[PDB]
Amino acid sequence: PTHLSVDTKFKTEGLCVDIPGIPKDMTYRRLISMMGFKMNYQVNGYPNMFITREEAIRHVRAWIGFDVEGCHGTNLPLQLGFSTGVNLVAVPTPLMYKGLPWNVVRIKIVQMLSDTLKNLSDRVVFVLWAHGFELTSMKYFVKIGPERTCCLCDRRATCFSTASDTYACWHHSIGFDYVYNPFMIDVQQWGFTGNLQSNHDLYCQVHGNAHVASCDAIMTRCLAVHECFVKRVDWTIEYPIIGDELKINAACRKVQHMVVKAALLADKFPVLHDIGNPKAIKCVPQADVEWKFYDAQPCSDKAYKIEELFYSYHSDKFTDGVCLFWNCNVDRYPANSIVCRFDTRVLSNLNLPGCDGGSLYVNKHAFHTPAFDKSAFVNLKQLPFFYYSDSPCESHGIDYVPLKSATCITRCNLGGAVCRHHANEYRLYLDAYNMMISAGFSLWVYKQFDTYNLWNTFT
Numbered sequence: 001p002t003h004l005s006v007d008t009k010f011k012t013e014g015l016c017v018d019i020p021g022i023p024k025d026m027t028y029r030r031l032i033s034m035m036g037f038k039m040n041y042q043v044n045g046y047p048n049m050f051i052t053r054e055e056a057i058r059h060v061r062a063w064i065g066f067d068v069e070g071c072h073g074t075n076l077p078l079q080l081g082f083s084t085g086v087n088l089v090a091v092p093t094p095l096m097y098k099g100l101p102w103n104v105v106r107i108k109i110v111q112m113l114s115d116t117l118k119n120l121s122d123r124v125v126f127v128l129w130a131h132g133f134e135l136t137s138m139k140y141f142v143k144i145g146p147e148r149t150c151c152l153c154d155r156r157a158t159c160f161s162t163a164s165d166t167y168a169c170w171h172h173s174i175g176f177d178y179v180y181n182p183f184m185i186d187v188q189q190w191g192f193t194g195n196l197q198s199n200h201d202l203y204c205q206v207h208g209n210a211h212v213a214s215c216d217a218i219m220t221r222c223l224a225v226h227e228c229f230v231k232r233v234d235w236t237i238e239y240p241i242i243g244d245e246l247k248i249n250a251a252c253r254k255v256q257h258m259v260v261k262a263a264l265l266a267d268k269f270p271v272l273h274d275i276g277n278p279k280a281i282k283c284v285p286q287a288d289v290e291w292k293f294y295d296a297q298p299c300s301d302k303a304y305k306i307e308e309l310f311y312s313y314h315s316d317k318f319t320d321g322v323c324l325f326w327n328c329n330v331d332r333y334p335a336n337s338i339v340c341r342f343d344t345r346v347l348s349n350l351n352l353p354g355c356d357g358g359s360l361y362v363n364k365h366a367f368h369t370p371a372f373d374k375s376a377f378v379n380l381k382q383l384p385f386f387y388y389s390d391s392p393c394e395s396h397g398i399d400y401v402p403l404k405s406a407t408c409i410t411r412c413n414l415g416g417a418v419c420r421h422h423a424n425e426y427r428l429y430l431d432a433y434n435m436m437i438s439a440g441f442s443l444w445v446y447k448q449f450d451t452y453n454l455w456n457t458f459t
């Protein structure tokens with residue numbers, strides 16, 4: 001059960017308007033053949049063009065929704081739409097391009113997929129709501145064969161060039177004209193009633209149906225993200241490292257310890273309500289405070305309602321002390337809170353577009369996050385940058401320029417001159433903070449938080 005057997009049945013009902021008379025009895029083997037591809041009993045790493053839902057979930061970064069709309073066929077021009085917002089018109093002689101022959105369209109497809117996917121994945125997974133034209137058009141821009149490696153590097157080949165007869169990955173495909181060994185999955189095989197728009201609109205109001213192929217390509221990938229990440233959650237699936245994953249995770253842990261430790265020193269709360277991960281650990285283990293944990297898994301659909309998290313009868317008095325919501329996405333935070341909330345609008349190789357304004361944040365594990373909403377933070381303010389340290393001023397053991405900063409809250413800065421140790425530590429902390437912010441995280445705190453209250457912890 002590693003790959004999808006070519007002898008598996010393919011439901012052809014959704015294909016019979018573009019392909020009238022299509023046999024009801026159909027396998028992947030006969031379908032790939034009908035599409036104009038020959039597999040030739042090849043045991044060479046590419047057993048099927050189509051993959052399982054489980055293999056698709058493991059390769060979510062490679063997903064590219066794809067739709068082809070005809071006219072009134074090899075007589076009519078076709079509009080090719082991708083979930084990148086691109087629409088290309090192919091002739092057989094929201095970015096809208098006028099009609100061009102396949103020999104130039106294929107060149108543009110290779111460029112577009114390579115630029116979208118080079119920093120995301122080692123492949124492309126065409127996400128379909130198959131009606132016929134998208135499958136019969138693949139022979140015009142896709143070549144298949146044995147698994148290969150890039151001509152300029154060790155990555156698997158994703159493109160082919162008829163000009164030089166060579167193969168390339170997404171990073172080395174400039175000038176390549178064919179998509180090599182792509183993958184694909186037909187969402188319509190999962191058991192749905194009604195068309196694409198009616199199933200998509202049950203869960204999402206952010207994507208419309210402007211009647212261009214890219215709108216359908218966008219809805220198809222959104223519907224697949226909903227089915228695989230919103231209504232079905234698998235936090236056991238691991239995803240490869242493609243960027244700053246480790247630095248960001250280390251930075252988040254550093255910022256969390258810093259912000260919570262300073263909030264407890266500045267306001268001396270007697271109790272802290274830690275709402276979120278059921279496996280959470282005290283981020284400030286030495287703090288005096290009464291630490292109380294409340295379990296809530298990451299919400300992937302809609303943000304938690306504070307009324308359901310807090311009410312229906314625990315300290316019961318969440319109004320006492322401070323509440324900590326570290327990536328616990330709620331509709332409206334209470335005024336006495338410390339909050340880390342992921343901003344779904346952030347553009348990054350870790351953040352993929354999601355369902356209903358939400359985003360799919362993929363960092364070791366895939367987490368669909370509900371749409372960022374500025375009104376969740378109305379009882380709070382943005383947490384300002386600051387570095388706090390009560391550790392001794394001692395170097396131990398990278399050349400220096402003296403640090404001058406009003407936000408370096410240390411004994412040495414109180415005393416007029418930041419020491420080398422606290423200056424190095426401040427700069428490392430500022431780097432970790434900037435990495436977390438730029439990765440998409442936002443920090444919020446109760447309105448009374450004032451770092452001026454940290455200076456008297458050095459007396």
Ligand SMILES: Cc1csc(CNC(=O)c2ccn[nH]2)n1
Nearest residue numbers: 069070071077078079211212213
């Ligand atoms: C050349 C050509 C063929 S189809 C087309 C315009 N697209 C649509 O009509 C449509 C319907 C749904 N999505 N797209 N242009």
Ligand SMILES: [Zn+2]
Nearest residue numbers: 150153169172
């Ligand atoms: Zn390469």
Ligand SMILES: [Zn+2]
Nearest residue numbers: 204207222356
């Ligand atoms: Zn959608």
Ligand SMILES: [Zn+2]
Nearest residue numbers: 393412419422
């Ligand atoms: Zn110091």
